[PDB]
Amino acid sequence: SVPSQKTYQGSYGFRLGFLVTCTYSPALNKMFCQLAKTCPVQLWVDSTPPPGTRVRAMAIYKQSQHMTEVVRRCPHHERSDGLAPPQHLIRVEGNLRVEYLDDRNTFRHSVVVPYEPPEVGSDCTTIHYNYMCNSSCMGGMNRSPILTIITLEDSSGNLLGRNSFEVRVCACPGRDRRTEEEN
Numbered sequence: 001s002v003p004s005q006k007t008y009q010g011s012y013g014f015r016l017g018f019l020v021t022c023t024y025s026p027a028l029n030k031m032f033c034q035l036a037k038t039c040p041v042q043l044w045v046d047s048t049p050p051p052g053t054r055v056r057a058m059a060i061y062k063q064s065q066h067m068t069e070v071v072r073r074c075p076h077h078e079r080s081d082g083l084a085p086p087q088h089l090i091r092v093e094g095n096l097r098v099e100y101l102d103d104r105n106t107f108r109h110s111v112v113v114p115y116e117p118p119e120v121g122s123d124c125t126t127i128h129y130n131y132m133c134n135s136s137c138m139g140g141m142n143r144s145p146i147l148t149i150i151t152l153e154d155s156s157g158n159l160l161g162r163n164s165f166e167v168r169v170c171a172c173p174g175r176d177r178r179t180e181e182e183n
């Protein structure tokens, strides 16, 4: 095998930040968002990564007992913006250089964009992700949670940094965040 979820700040001090259609809980390190809606994820670095640095997002199941299962869209939702393959859970909006990738070995999907430094007047780089299936399509009986793993990689695909966060795609993110935080 499964992709590692191990936090790895690496040489460049790679960290994530987060800002309802999308709400994040630091307490739970969990994003709550609606299907297909904008999910802004911030990339923070302490120094600039090398030229050709790329940013990959992939979903895995959080529970060890389900980690070998590939996270994909349910049969209903699978059966597109013109760019994303229909099976891919995670899309990127507002980027002209998106790559949708299927691992030849593990069959796992991922979505990659070039690393861009922050825009003038900003301190971080923001990527807008969209999740294209609900957690209720995704986790059968006991509602199986997923993680998004964000990796900073060099141009050859070598690991430069890694962070992750749990995600719940749901109709009412504010309500679910509240409930899970109370629990």
Ligand SMILES: [Zn+2]
Pocket: 073, 074, 075, 076, 077, 132, 133, 134, 137, 138
């Ligand atoms: Zn679905």
